[PDB]
């Protein structure tokens, strides 16, 4: 790894640590039970409702006008995505050539990349039993999410399935930061104006990723192609997620979609 490419990997990593509220080290410290403001455990309806009253009090301050639990949970899912979209938009500036792209191309890349990146990074807050939520202040169990009424019980399980395998690769955030940058730099997204420049930007970050994995994971000679496959798997996970969100939109009148997320989904797949 030349000084320039090692430096670029470090730049990316530092931008990740700055711009994401959650990183894998921070998540592991919490998940280990290692303590001021430890996470509320949400494993059933009683504990969901207690957690809501402390952590999202406005959402349950409406008396009997409060929405159904599953709809409140989905609203909190969406708020989490909106916040992660903001973080990803600032992170993207650290990627060589991204800020030099036409504004419309930056929008297109973020539109198609954000959910892939969201689900990749969600792995860092997931273990086989549950996941961190609410800025690290809740732990919601995988079984509780599976217990929700249909269709809401179908949202998170495929993301756990992705995450258990992704986490078995034992990436750290120096790896994950470059993987997220590579997700954002896909030249095959629909509607790009300057494909060739995006392809060169992609090639550059993927080269940095390949060299970084070779150095940081000398034990796994397949790690780079494994991650290329994970990117394809994410694209599929997102297509399926968008299909479920469309079902919710059509059949669940109380589950209002945030306008930023509606725009991301519009004409996506
Ligand atoms: C009191 C706390 C309740 C916590 C539930 C929070 C679960 C948020 C994590 C991500 C959800 C997945 C986002 C995809 S689902 C919404 C979307 O499509 O953006």
UniProtKB/Swiss-Prot annotation:
List GO BP terms, alphabetically. behavioral response to nicotine; cell differentiation; cellular response to fructose stimulus; cellular response to starvation; circadian regulation of gene expression; enamel mineralization; epidermis development; fatty acid metabolic process
Expression sites (tissue/organ)? Skeletal muscle, liver, heart and kidney. Expressed in monocytes.
Annotated NR LBD domain ranges read 40-267
Q: How is it modified after translation?
A: Ubiquitinated by E3 ubiquitin-protein ligase HUWE1; leading to proteasomal degradation.
**One GO CC annotation:** nucleoplasm
Keyword Cell inner membrane: yes or no? no
Q: What is the effect of changing residue 232 to T?
A: No effect on heterodimerization with RXRA nor on DNA binding
Question: GO: which molecular function terms?
Answer: DNA binding; DNA-binding transcription activator activity; DNA-binding transcription activator activity, RNA polymerase II-specific; DNA-binding transcription factor activity; DNA-binding transcription factor activity, RNA polymerase II-specific; DNA-binding transcription repressor activity, RNA polymerase II-specific; lipid binding; MDM2/MDM4 family protein binding
Q: What induces it?
A: Down-regulated by aging.
**Which family does the record claim for this protein?**
Belongs to the nuclear hormone receptor family. NR1 subfamily.
Job description of the protein: Ligand-activated transcription factor. Key regulator of lipid metabolism. Activated by the endogenous ligand 1-palmitoyl-2-oleoyl-sn-glycerol-3-phosphocholine (16:0/18:1-GPC). Activated by oleylethanolamide, a naturally occurring lipid that regulates satiety. Receptor for peroxisome proliferators such as hypolipidemic drugs and fatty acids. Regulates the peroxisomal beta-oxidation pathway of fatty acids. Functions as a transcription activator for the ACOX1 and P450 genes. Transactivation activity requires heterodimerization with RXRA and is antagonized by NR2C2.
Provide the protein name: Peroxisome proliferator-activated receptor alpha
Identify the coding gene. PPARA
Report where the shown chain sits in the full-length sequence: first residue, last residue, total length: 200 to 468 of 468
